[PDB]
Design a protein around this motif. Sequence first.
Motif, PDB file in Angstrom:
ATOM      1  N   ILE A  44       5.568  -1.258   5.030  1.00  0.00           N
ATOM      2  CA  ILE A  44       4.850  -1.031   6.305  1.00  0.00           C
ATOM      3  C   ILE A  44       3.449  -1.581   6.121  1.00  0.00           C
ATOM      4  O   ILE A  44       2.722  -1.406   5.131  1.00  0.00           O
ATOM      5  N   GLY A  47       0.983   0.386  10.142  1.00  0.00           N
ATOM      6  CA  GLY A  47       1.645   1.179  11.136  1.00  0.00           C
ATOM      7  C   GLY A  47       3.233   0.799  11.449  1.00  0.00           C
ATOM      8  O   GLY A  47       3.983   1.582  11.441  1.00  0.00           O
ATOM      9  N   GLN A  49       6.675  -1.194  10.595  1.00  0.00           N
ATOM     10  CA  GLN A  49       7.691  -1.499   9.361  1.00  0.00           C
ATOM     11  C   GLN A  49       8.185  -2.923   9.453  1.00  0.00           C
ATOM     12  O   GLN A  49       9.042  -2.996  10.166  1.00  0.00           O
ATOM     13  N   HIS A  68       1.952  -0.851   2.508  1.00  0.00           N
ATOM     14  CA  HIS A  68       2.335   0.354   1.891  1.00  0.00           C
ATOM     15  C   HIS A  68       3.928   0.427   1.686  1.00  0.00           C
ATOM     16  O   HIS A  68       4.798   0.138   2.500  1.00  0.00           O
TER      17      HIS A  68
END
Lengths: 73, 75
Positions: A44, A47, A49, A68
Amino acid sequence: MQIFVKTLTGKTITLEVEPSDTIENVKAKIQDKEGIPPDQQRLIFAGKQLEDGRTLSDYNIQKESTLHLVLRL
Amino acid sequence: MQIFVKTLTGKTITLEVEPSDTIENVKAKIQDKEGIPPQQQRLIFAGKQLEDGRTLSDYNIQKESTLHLVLRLRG
Ligand SMILES: [Zn+2]
Ligand SMILES: [Zn+2]
Ligand SMILES: [Zn+2]
Ligand SMILES: [Zn+2]
Ligand SMILES: [Zn+2]
Ligand SMILES: [Zn+2]
Ligand SMILES: [Zn+2]
């Protein structure tokens, strides 16, 4: 250029990428550094993906950006 | 019944649910179809964040409703 990949427990790992590196490409790099199969990771950025086959630039991810990492196991 | 979840991919998934399903139930359902652990999910609906211990009836969420799913990140 460099980018960072933050995990769940905060562990911050660094990557050497290229602007037009696909996402399936990043997963392979993580596999090399952490032994986690690409088919297990989901990435991600800001926000959203990211999906493999789209490039870092396709998402405006530049030097020293942070992705992330989440896992499906 | 059925409700809709806007995932992290911008896509949208369909959930078959019961009205008494708590949010912890719904998070678990998402864990199967998407891969995200319940401990990492944050579910939004009609301006509200839904707590693990409340049901779909509490927030009064009906059929074909849509929930925006969000990552639970910090640091
Ligand atoms: Zn470099
Ligand atoms: Zn090259
Ligand atoms: Zn893949
Ligand atoms: Zn971030
Ligand atoms: Zn249920
Ligand atoms: Zn299951
Ligand atoms: Zn209740």
